Symmetry: none
Amino acid sequence: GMSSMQHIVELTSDLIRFPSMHSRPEQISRCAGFIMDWCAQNGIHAERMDHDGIPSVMVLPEKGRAGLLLMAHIDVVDAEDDLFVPRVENDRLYGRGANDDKYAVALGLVMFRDRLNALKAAGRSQKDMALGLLITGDEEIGGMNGAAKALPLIRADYVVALDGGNPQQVITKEKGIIDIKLTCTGKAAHGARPWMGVNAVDLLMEDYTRLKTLFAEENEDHWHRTVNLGRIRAGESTNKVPDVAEGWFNIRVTEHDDPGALIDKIRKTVSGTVSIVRTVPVFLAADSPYTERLLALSGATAGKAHGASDARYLGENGLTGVVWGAEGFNTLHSRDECLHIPSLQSIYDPLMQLAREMEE
Amino acid sequence: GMSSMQHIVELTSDLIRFPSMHSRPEQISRCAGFIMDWCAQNGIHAERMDHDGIPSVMVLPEKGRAGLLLMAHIDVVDAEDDLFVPRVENDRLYGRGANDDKYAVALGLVMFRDRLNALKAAGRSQKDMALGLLITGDEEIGGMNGAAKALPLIRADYVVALDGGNPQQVITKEKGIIDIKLTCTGKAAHGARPWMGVNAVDLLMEDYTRLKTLFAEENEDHWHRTVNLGRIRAGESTNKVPDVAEGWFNIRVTEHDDPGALIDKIRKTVSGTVSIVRTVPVFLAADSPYTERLLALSGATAGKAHGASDARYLGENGLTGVVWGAEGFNTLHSRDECLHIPSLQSIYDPLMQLAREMEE
């Protein structure tokens, strides 16, 4: 018989082979179908939902409920083709999704199987489980059709979003997001006589300089608000002075940067008009005896992360939880993406003990 | 007199009703077809040829030859629908192509018909004409399939490109054009950790700042090289650091600015990669007794202009000519586009006299 550790690496490797990028929606779907089949072949009842083309799989003690809910996702960021061929080197598994986030999917699936098999041997059944899984297909694009739709269906006592941190760091804080569009209006003219116009790109550049002044803080841990000019658009014809320029900025906020105040200050600082595209709140984990117990069981300490996750949906659903994960050496979203294989046990052991303590 | 010019107003108005934009090649073709039918109906022998959907309509005394060739174009830049319904008010004809350039087409055709009928009444025929017409369908996109193809087939003593200047100014010099694309490559990163990337938009903006320092010459008539950033594009997702940014620049050059030297200097100065979209040489009219006679007949003075035209093809075909035209109040390419109707006589009379002098 194969070890659970080896089962997880094998399953993770299988999942990696689906190039489940958002530009390949049928691959996200097929990867979810593979999961449904894996559950089926293991005697595990799972339920699939699909919302506006995004699949989520729920693997629960019973419909609508779990004790300890593990939340993970099967969508991945873009990679070149070679990163969809998993490989092991020394104690590392390499590939897109090795640490973000297919190992977590594999780990939760194996944990569920393992514990269900133990309960069955004792004459108990899936309804006796405390552990449940939520596996979604759109975390990388903000979770609107995945976690946002699935979480309202699940009464859970505690949620671990297995998509961040490391074995020593349970994430209790993540930066929020304000995406804005700045529109600068100049004056059209013929490119043959451009002194008769006012180039709206030059205006947008002047505003960008001004906007950067509100993002002047720096420190070693980069724990401060940041701004990123993600997209710019101006003009159509090469030979006209453009009269409208648009820049889309991705602002990240700490818990101390009130978004409303910051929006007001930005509007006072720039000459162009500022529209708000979307906000994502800072994640602040609720105080919980489950968190204290997880820290005791794991030896991790509470930490903070730059990126937002599906943990942003816990509060709107009155759920409590944290972000956690195995060791990826900060290689997420890169060609070097890997998983430290031995670190799987560091996650499995405390989560399994927690789940068992939560059983009746 | 005005009743005779009214024939040109009417014909121009009919031509304006064809939305002969490049996105509507069938309308360019149909408008050329209308012209061919008009010639036949008026007892004028005309010839059409096409290259990649661009018509050239030639109305000549004999195959391959004219004395005074008038060169004009039927293609127009885009407009809203209401600009294709011609209207007259306050001594002005309004619509797309009213001044750029369907009035000139109409003017040439009416000149040709008027003089031809007089010749026929005196027992002469089309072979005895001095006047010829070249009507093309791609001046607005650079003429490579119109004027570029027709001019090598026509020997003319003098050419008037009726597509610029005004009744007081015969244009003997036009700036050249260099159209470039600048591509800057940075380093992708997630917008949550932007310090891990290099923003290609910042790179492009920095190169644009550099590029401006090569266009620092100033003088009171703006007779110097210029640069216009016409279009900028970077990014898809707000939440990534963009790794490629593109800008398209329209550069104008005087006779003093060698285009190869300037391109080389640009490439040396900017960090990004510069691709040449196209170049158009400076137009410098050859000295000619025909120009001196036209000035005498019209009371115009020689001038220079910032924009370019199909006159840029004269020199490479060994032809002598100038740019001239009726009064459009600089409303080309605008919603206000119009022709001052009384200016037609000011163009008709000197050109008709010059042509008669070339018969003798």
